[PDB]
Design an enzyme around this catalytic site. Sequence first.
Site, PDB file in Angstrom:
ATOM      1  N   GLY A 181       0.805  -1.205   0.000  1.00  0.00           N
ATOM      2  CA  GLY A 181       0.000   0.000   0.000  1.00  0.00           C
ATOM      3  C   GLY A 181       0.840   1.257   0.000  1.00  0.00           C
ATOM      4  CB  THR A 182      -0.198   4.750   0.350  1.00  0.00           C
ATOM      5  OG1 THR A 182      -0.699   5.485  -0.771  1.00  0.00           O
ATOM      6  CG2 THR A 182       0.409   5.709   1.378  1.00  0.00           C
ATOM      7  CB  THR A 183       5.605   4.569   0.550  1.00  0.00           C
ATOM      8  OG1 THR A 183       6.518   5.560   1.044  1.00  0.00           O
ATOM      9  CG2 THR A 183       5.452   4.723  -0.999  1.00  0.00           C
TER      10      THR A 183
END
Lengths: 196, 243, 83, 244, 198, 232, 111, 234, 231, 204
Positions: free
Chosen positions: D30-32
């Site tokens: 997922g998004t960092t």
Amino acid sequence: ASIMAVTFKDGVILGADSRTTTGAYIANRVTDKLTRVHDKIWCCRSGSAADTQAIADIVQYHLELYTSQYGTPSTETAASVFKELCYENKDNLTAGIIVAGYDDKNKGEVYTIPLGGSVHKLPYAIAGSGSTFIYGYCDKNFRENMSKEETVDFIKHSLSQAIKWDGSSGGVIRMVVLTAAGVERLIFYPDEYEQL
Amino acid sequence: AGYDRHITIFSPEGRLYQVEYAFKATNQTNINSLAVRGKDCTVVISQKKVPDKLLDPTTVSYIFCISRTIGMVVNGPIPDARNAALRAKAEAAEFRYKYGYDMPCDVLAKRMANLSQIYTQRAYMRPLGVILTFVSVDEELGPSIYKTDPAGYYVGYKATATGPKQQEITTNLENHFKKSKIDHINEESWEKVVEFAITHMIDALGTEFSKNDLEVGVATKDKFFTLSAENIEERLVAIAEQD
Amino acid sequence: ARSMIEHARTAAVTHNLYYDEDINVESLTQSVCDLALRFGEGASGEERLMSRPFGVALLIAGHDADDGYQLFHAEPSGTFYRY
Amino acid sequence: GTGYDLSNSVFSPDGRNFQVEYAVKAVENGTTSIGIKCNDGVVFAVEKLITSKLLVPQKNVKIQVVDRHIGCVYSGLIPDGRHLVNRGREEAASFKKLYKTPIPIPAFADRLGQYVQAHTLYNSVRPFGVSTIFGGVDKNGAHLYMLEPSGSYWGYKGAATGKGRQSAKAELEKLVDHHPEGLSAREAVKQAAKIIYLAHEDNKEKDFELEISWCSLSETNGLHKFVKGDLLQEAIDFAQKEIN
Amino acid sequence: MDIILGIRVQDSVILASSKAVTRGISVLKDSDDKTRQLSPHTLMSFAGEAGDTVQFAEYIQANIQLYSIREDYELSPQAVSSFVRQELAKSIRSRRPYQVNVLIGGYDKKKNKPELYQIDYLGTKVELPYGAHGYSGFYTFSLLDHHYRPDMTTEEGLDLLKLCVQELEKRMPMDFKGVIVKIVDKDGIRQVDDFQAQ
Amino acid sequence: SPEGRLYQVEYALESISHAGTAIGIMASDGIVLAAERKVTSTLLEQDTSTEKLYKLNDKIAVAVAGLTADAEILINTARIHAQNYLKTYNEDIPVEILVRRLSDIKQGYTQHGGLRPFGVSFIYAGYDDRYGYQLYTSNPSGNYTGWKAISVGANTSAAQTLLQMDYKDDMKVDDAIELALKTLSKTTDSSALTYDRLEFATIRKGANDGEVYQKIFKPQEIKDILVKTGIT
Amino acid sequence: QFNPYGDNGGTILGIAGEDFAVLAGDTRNITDYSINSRYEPKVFDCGDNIVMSANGFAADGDALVKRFKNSVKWYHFDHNDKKLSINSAARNIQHLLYGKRFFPYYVHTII
Amino acid sequence: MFRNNYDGDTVTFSPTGRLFQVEYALEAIKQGSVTVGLRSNTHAVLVALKRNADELSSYQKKIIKCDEHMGLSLAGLAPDARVLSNYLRQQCNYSSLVFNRKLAVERAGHLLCDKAQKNTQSYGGRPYGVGLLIIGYDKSGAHLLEFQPSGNVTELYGTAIGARSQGAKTYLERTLDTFIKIDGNPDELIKAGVEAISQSLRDESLTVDNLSIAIVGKDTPFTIYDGEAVAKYI
Amino acid sequence: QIDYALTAVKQGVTSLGIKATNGVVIATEKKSSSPLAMSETLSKVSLLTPDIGAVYSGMGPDYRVLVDKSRKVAHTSYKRIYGEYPPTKLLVSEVAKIMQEATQSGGVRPFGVSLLIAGHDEFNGFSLYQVDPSGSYFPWKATAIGKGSVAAKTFLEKRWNDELELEDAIHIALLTLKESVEGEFNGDTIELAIIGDENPDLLGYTGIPTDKGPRFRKLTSQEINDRLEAL
Amino acid sequence: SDPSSINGGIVVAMTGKDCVAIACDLRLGSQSLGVSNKFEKIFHYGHVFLGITGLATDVTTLNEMFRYKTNLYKLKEERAIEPETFTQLVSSSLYERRFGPYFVGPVVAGINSKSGKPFIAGFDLIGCIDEAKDFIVSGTASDQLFGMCESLYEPNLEPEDLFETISQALLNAADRDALSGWGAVVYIIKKDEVVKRYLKMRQD
């Protein structure tokens, strides 16, 4: 009862009489109305002995547990735990309490919790049955930033009076000095405080 | 079917598969600990392993302060250690309030082992992957060291060790109470008992320690506290200037 | 469908009591569907207390003064069409 | 037999709870998102991916605030971030109500720790699908924490989690190396924007907005305000310069 | 209150029960059967609180017609009694207590004897030759004391009953508008509807 | 429940034909109960248990054939129904009503199929002044049945036959005491019958008047009536 | 003791015409002997051409108006924006008022 | 063939980090008719294609009023929307009673996300199986949200969900800078919503019974046009 | 499933019990899970009432929480009603009922222990009971449970007569335990309790002559070694 | 009005040489009106006797209850319940309803079959156990009975003597009591025989 707490340059001092009366009879003339909820956070009890005892007992816990998890408790916090009990239970309690303690940041801190359950931070606070008679002496003779023995004296006199005039107050005068250097318990006997 | 391997029920040979596995988890951290008795102190040494340079060593602790008097050191995944420590920190505050005296080391252990037992007998809850080593200087028994395990078992040790190289450490201690033929370490100041606990661990692990690879907990009468970064370096400096 | 009907007769009289008017056929129908919409043995949010989809279909037909004469098909699934 | 990984409470033969390890995989995909602890506060940053042109700019906020003085950012299953931050606030307000002081960072962390860890105890509830980075300023300075689905949490000088995990963690170690005394509240913001812009090359397919918030004892008097307007461009323009 | 009488003779039990129902100011009915049949050979007359009265007697009627139907056995008087008692004793420390007084009279088909039980709203139960609730007892117990033999024919006992009612009509301030006399014997429960002029 | 069959029941109904062996014989002026004891060790304490013959009230008693820990759970609740029917109607509880009260709890599991059926089969011997002396039976099926003489447990099918043979309606009580022992000639896996493998009981027309004494036999009293033939 | 009730006074009047209806009230809101407001309205438009007034104790009437104004919002959502028959709102108000039968809305109330 | 072991329920994570039971629900969206949503700076419009059963039956309603300032359209499982549209109707009506405040659109997004999330933590219950386009005018302008049953609610200028959603989703993607500038015009913003939903039809023909439109904004409260009211846009 | 628990009982340290004419005796061994551990901190022979003790074979923990639940039930269900303590027969019943419920209840496994409960009540005299995981319970003149179960049970038939004085049964239960012993054999690895004469020495007070003190006495590390020399 | 003083009645118990006696009046009345003269206040459960005074529907209820409780003690405990024990069961049993008490004044009397020791004790409505070597009294003539006993009693009376003594204490108190009388009954309890005599007294 007949109790008070005063702040100064080095910390805070708690003072009280020792007379719990049921009726006209002094059931105990040596009561320890200075009760400890933490190293350097104590209270002054007045009102039902059974109510103030139960509460302080329950606060001593909340704070022992707060210490376990989250660390050392602000003097402010002790007060909040008292208010939360007294206010949220007003209908069934008769207790007027003075919470006082020393941390290193603020030094002398004092919170008075009247019957309602309200909370009031102050430089000094008086309470208990025989307080009515010294609102005059205290407002006139109190000063901020007093020295240790200046404050012991201020308390000795104030309480010498309260006991003279109150029948529901008396015994010995207990004090408890709360500073960086530790906890010092005081006692002054009748042969002494009467001759003032 | 073959599902007596997944919950806390009896295998056909009277085994609790899930508990035996739970034990295997206590090593998953890869820290070793030992505990000793003094004439009037108790000491727990654990390893501190900080691999990530992004970590803050001060927040990395497998040593928990449970009460004024009582210390606990856990071998096991951090999440489970805290679940246990928080529950003990609260069983001991409740104990003081209900019963009027501070909670005693061996009673806290019996109570967590009792707990650790329910997990061992109820389908739906799982045991914890931790071995709780409890220390104190209990007002009646003296220096105390009591250890509970996922099995529900508790017992009191002269000294003890736990974790991966557990038996290398254990067998070192055994050979030093076979030799002084007592139940403790005859030194007065806790400092020398801490030095001794670090010594007999260096000896047993065959590696030296720096002020950063150790966590020390200490129990005297009326206090249990942990040693700071520097309070240890002092202890190490003293070992090195005699050995 | 004994229970499915009991709930509809009960809903229609209950409406007549609380409001002094005959209950809309559209809403009498939807109320019956809202009943068979409590199918399940594990629901968090709101509880749906019962055991299985309601094993019967309904043709519901009546008259209210808003929308003339009406015919409805109530399915066990909790939804409907007005054929 | 086997089947040691379909149930949540269940110990693998050598001490592992497999369902947790799977959740960590959802985190990794997922998004960092990152956090930096500076000399009097914390700075937070997140990568907002842009599915299509129709997503509205600046208007899908990912960073959540707890109380008044705490920030949370998470990577992974987003709705689990919300369910966790919700229980996060109920907790931070239980605390305030009774002890008056707003909940201390380390004590807040232990409270999330137990909620998460307690979601690894029964076969009938799945672990959180998020590693959560959070922190703020309390009575004794700044604290940055990170908390994975297992319940594990520790205090970091910096932290990362998400697709660009290994990449940011490495630029993060670069600063802790150069400046041991921590960055300045303002500098930490410029740098967090660099680090996100970089850890984006591990997801360079889609486009992205940056989002930064901070809590600084000097630059937002202890509270958790967002970074916006001129100071946001200040840093977006500093990233572009260290990407080219 | 409200006239509840009963006398147990040799071969039966007799229950008198005022016919009047009064609602404060007006007399609403002049013909109230203040008694439910609990089963072929067991009768219960009753008086007391307004609504509490009937609602209880009917609850007992149901529960005894149910034990009758279930074991196809006619529950004995001693038992019907000791059950009604427990049901009152239960309700005395309850939220709203049944405020009802009762006379249970019936023929024990197994001892072939008649039995009369007296139970007050408190659960106070005792077995008697004759009995009454309310004030009914004061005017009449002095007569029964005197003229009662336990070998009295059912006829001899009706006579003595009329004599009590007559005294109640003379020295009692309430117009209770007569009685209904019922008799319980081996043949069951029949009602004498020729009384205020026998 | 495939063909109209009560499976989990037959399971336990035939688990019964394993444990124990019990007998009941109704005479014209008394009733008799009797049982064999489970596989005994030398060191097991004979006199104490009264493990398979339980008193329910001063006028009722049961013989058990089944799992002990399982019948105690039942009997405990039946000794109570007895006393509730006292405190309530101030008459001693009628036998059929007590029997049905249990039979209904047995069948309670024979249907709320979320908990496991009952081991245990009962012979009940009781007296109430509505239906003279009575003899009843209670399989975990839920059914009860009237009996002039009956048996449950291992070797059941066998004794039912000898019983059918030597029984006469005019039978006295002592005549039925014998018939019970005599026909635990056969139905005994232990070659030769001892006083210690036994437990006995009687409900007679009183040791005096027109009333009802109850008597669970003490070991010695058995070795005394065993004396009449069995062993000597 | 605590006494949960009041009088705020005012006075309302409702008249039914042949092709119309009026529902009038004064604007004065009082406590005992003092005046609270000279303008604080008593008579309310509830939609679906229904005007009502819950007069006596303001807090209880204000609260009852709120609760019915809401009963309308939901008779809409629940019955496809249907108009609330005057006669039907009357009955719904009976059920509203009788709901608190043993702690009533202290109001004489007119629609 | 290829079996799945981790798709049993919602309390079970796939090895790669995936909740299959949720991905399956996210697909139930596409099992219902197409609906479209778009907004200028002054209005938000919805267009849905009501689908029928026979020639002989009514058409399923696809738009539901929530308050006078907020409404939504559904594509997917009907009962799941009846259940969610109702919850929304409550919070809206509670933010009105307790705080006398129109419930923010940005906030009903946050509230549904958390409502649907609850159904993906729990053993036993299945996830929500419907998608929602939500519109409203709050204190902060026009607004549009996409609600997928995963919990992920996202705020947009336009989107489309369901059967052949892809036709419109691609029109709006190109029309962007054109329609978000349709301020102060209401009839013209609907003309656009409808010219977009009609990219997602085959040889299919909108009629008075096929079409369902709703609108809201500045000084227009949420109103719904079914039947003859919709003719003017065909 | 009950059958598998009886199996955990079949392994796990041996324990025994012998009733006599004027006392009862129960003992087991204290297998030290280590020499580092102090074996005095765990008690395999526990007091339930001052007239009743208990020993086990099997799963340590399950015994602890059963000894606790057991002490409490003695008060909650007897002492607080009738002012007396419960009789061996009935306290035993209340424990069987406790274990029998872990059986027939869902979501819980039965206990991994067989118990030997020994005691004296004024009316039933002495008695010794065994309680199994199944919730069944049987009265014994003497028996053993655990590994050494079969060896020792056979030795007890050989050596037991109904004329044993309690001192004779102590002697026996030491021999019996000497053949099975796994570890070392002294006072530090033997736990032995008796149920004998009333011990006024151990009441803690003096002034009411009607209550005379505990019948249950747990022999000290010393008393054991003393008997093993003259053995 | 007063519950202990509605139906009335008295009960009295004494000890002698290896024996005990318990006795009561047969009166049951609503206030002034006497209703029954055959209402006994003494019940037995095995060899342990219990007299109970006060409110009828509670005297009755407690009999019905202790029969139940003691019947199950017999079946479960394999023996008949002892007096010392039953005493402790009445205490805990009465105190169960501490804040809604049975308005009764129980007297326990009987002989411990193992030790052959005579035993009497009395309670207040919430279970305080007054155990006494001499005598126990209870009722509406609490006072009168205490007066008679304090004079007429000597310890270790032979049974045929202690009947005369207990009878005269009871009789003469109830004659100075308005709410007691109408008959009387007196159980004399030897170690294995128990005799129950009814008495002749005024009837007013």
